[PDB]
């Protein structure tokens, strides 16, 4: 089997991408944030504290003839940005882009943190990291991809995120028309439960490529590109007037600037992020200070190849017995 679904930016900055997901019988379609940095499929629901729902579409398990309470199971998650959610668990039929999994754990939120409530466009998350990170207790549950894997034509999914435009998540096949050149594959460590890999270096604009190992994670659920402070300083030094602002929380730059590209290495191959992709717009409405899309990871503990990086590539998440990542230009 295969599946193919369009993923759509939630706003004009590509802050996140939503993909429609069919849950239950008859289907209830929710728009989920596919997140290769986490491993829970959780949804706003009829169980979510009413004051914490503000415009999201909810899953109502009592209206699904295939829903079954997973007795005793609870979940609770905290994300790298400080947001969180928790609740109980049902199993139900879940379909993405024509690919159906029966008995998928659907984690129903009883509580969500304010950032989720405040984002009316995201009805939940669909985790695509390794199932070892799934938070369901006392019986850890598998991701949608893990459940689908054996049925797929090939045990892979691909992320093709658009810049200011829709893109595609495919399951079970590699669309050879969706990228240019060849796909360069690179080793993955699953030791932390992430799609963790090592970039071979970087360049700023037309500058020389610096060969240096940068370990990080491919994370579709993170907006920005978070890299070591040395790398980030070298990038923003090429933008007149750019500076790190403790009050804003990162590097800002004059909105009148033209940003240089940023290249990252994948083996001997190179992925070029155009400068435009690094502009996240005014820090507040009407400001002439703009927020940068490359930020320091120094306070995170891990480097994160988030959407800013991934949307410059066609990305293969190869879930074979020994997982690997593939990157192609497009």
């Amino acid at each position: 089997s295969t599946g193919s679904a369009t993923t759509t930016p939630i706003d004009s900055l590509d802050d996140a991408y939503i993909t429609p997901v069919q849950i239950g019988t008859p289907a209830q379609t929710l728009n989920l944030d596919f997140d290769t940095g986490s491993s829970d499929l959780w949804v706003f629901s009829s169980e979510t504290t009413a004051s914490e729902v503000d415009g999201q579409t909810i899953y109502t398990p009592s209206k699904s003839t295939t829903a079954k309470l997973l007795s005793g199971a609870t979940w609770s998650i905290s994300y790298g940005d400080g947001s969180s959610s928790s609740g109980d668990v049902y199993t139900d039929t879940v379909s993405v882009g024509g690919l159906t999994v029966t008995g998928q754990a659907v984690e129903s939120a009883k509580k969500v943190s304010s950032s989720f409530t405040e984002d009316s466009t995201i009805d939940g998350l669909l985790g695509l990291a390794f199932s070892t990170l799934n938070t369901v207790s006392p019986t850890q549950q598998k991701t949608f991809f893990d459940n689908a894997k054996a049925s797929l034509d090939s045990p892979v999914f691909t992320a093709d995120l658009g810049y200011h435009a829709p893109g595609t998540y495919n399951f079970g096949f590699i669309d050879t028309t969706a990228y240019t050149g060849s796909i360069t594959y690179t080793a993955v460590s699953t030791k932390q439960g992430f799609w963790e890999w090592t970039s071979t270096g970087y360049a700023v604009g037309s500058g020389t490529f610096k060969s240096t190992s940068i370990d990080g994670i491919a994370d579709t659920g993170t907006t920005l590109l978070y890299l070591p402070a040395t790398v980030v300083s070298a990038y923003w030094a090429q933008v007149s007037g750019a500076k790190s602002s403790s009050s804003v929380g990162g590097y800002v730059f004059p909105c009148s600037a033209t940003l240089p590209s940023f290249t990252f290495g994948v083996g001997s191959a190179r992925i070029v992020i155009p400068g435009d992709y690094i502009d996240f717009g005014p820090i507040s409405t009407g400001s002439s200070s703009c927020f940068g899309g490359i930020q320091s990871s120094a306070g995170i503990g891990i480097n994160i190849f988030g959407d800013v990086a991934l949307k410059a590539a066609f990305v293969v998440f190869n879930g074979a017995t020994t997982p690997t990542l593939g990157f192609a230009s497009k």
Side-chain angles (χ1 to χ4, degrees), residues 28 119 190 229:
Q28 301 178 38
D119 185 1
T190 64

Side-chain angles (χ1 to χ4, degrees), residues 185-190 192-198:
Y185 290 86
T186 197
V188 165
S189 172
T190 64
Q192 296 191 82
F194 301 122
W195 293 92
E196 187 171 0
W197 65 289
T198 301

